[PDB]
Design a protein around this ligand. Structure first.
Ligand SMILES: c1cnc(N2CCN(c3cc(-c4ccncc4)cnn3)CC2)nc1
Length: 280
């Protein structure tokens, strides 16, 4: 599949840089014909078939195909796609209130009510994705953006669909590996992956929201990965002594090694607490 090959600068003016991933740069932009503002994500293409730099065309096309499918309040959406010799340029919905990662660093830790207010929205977005058989595979606070960080109950959108895959057989078996602190044991062990890996990541995010601390983090990436595979985490009294047992129960039912025994997204919404790259 091919994308619009006119120069993106003929249609948009770019501004502030917002983020800078590995093979991607994100800049705020403005469409000339409407005045509306977006985030332009420039993804570097591979320069040869055998090249390690850049993103393969297969991987770019998959990300674009997934983004085109989605429309939900808690997920980023896609406005347009351009390309040239060096980059594919995704014109995405602008989410201007920064990352959940940076919001958390300012608060130290959240109350249970603040945590559930964020978590309910994350769960709603993942329920939508999993309903479409989309596994995100890279859920972490850096990939949760706030629409406006200066309101009592900030609204969020899930971003960064660069690892997302459609799971048409209940599992997939490709080269997929996200950030060590957040990956499930089946990722660490190179086993077939499905929608359950995202539920593990949600358990990690919940632990962090409540404590300010990362449950499996070691001093090196390999140590983190070993901790994940062994389910080597515990609720430290210093952080959790006054956290409700139901919050701990929710986390416990997500941080389960066997993916078949982990809570599904539907389970998580009925849980009583809720119910109303890898190498150094
Ligand atoms: C370490 C450090 N930062 C990160 N980020 C930074 C954020 N990133 C982004 C941001 C956007 C985006 C979309 C719409 N409006 C604003 C921004 C799109 N795509 N990627 C990726 C995750 N990850 C690890």
């Amino acid at each position: 599949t091919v994308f619009r090959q006119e120069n993106v600068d003929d249609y948009y003016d770019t501004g502030e840089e917002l983020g800078s991933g590995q093979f991607a740069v994100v800049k705020k932009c403005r469409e000339k014909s409407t005045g509306l503002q977006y985030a332009a994500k420039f993804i570097k293409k591979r320069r040869t078939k055998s090249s390690r730099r850049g993103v393969s065309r297969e991987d770019i096309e998959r990300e674009v195909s997934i983004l085109k499918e989605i429309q939900h309040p808690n997920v980023i959406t896609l406005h347009e796609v351009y390309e040239n010799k060096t980059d594919v340029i995704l014109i995405l919905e602008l989410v201007a209130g920064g990352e959940l990662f940076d919001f958390l660093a300012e608060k130290e830790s959240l109350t249970e009510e603040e945590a559930t207010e964020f978590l309910k929205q994350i769960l709603n977005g993942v329920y939508y994705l999993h309903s479409l058989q989309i596994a995100h595979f890279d859920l972490k606070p850096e990939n949760i953006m706030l629409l406006d960080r200066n309101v009592p109950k900030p609204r969020i959108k899930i971003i960064d669909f660069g690892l997302a895959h459609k799971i048409d057989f209940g599992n997939e078996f490709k080269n997929i590996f996200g950030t060590p602190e957040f990956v499930a044991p089946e990722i660490v062990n190179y086993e077939p992956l499905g929608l359950e890996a995202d539920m593990w990541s949600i358990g990690v995010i919940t632990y962090i929201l409540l404590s300010g601390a990362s449950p499996f983090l070691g001093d090196t990436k390999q140590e983190t990965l070993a901790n994940v595979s062994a389910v080597n985490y515990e609720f430290e009294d210093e952080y959790f002594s006054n956290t409700s047992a139901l919050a701990k129960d929710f986390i416990r039912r997500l941080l389960v090694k066997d993916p078949k025994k982990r809570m599904t997204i539907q389970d998580s919404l009925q849980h009583p607490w809720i119910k109303p790259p890898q190498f150094e």
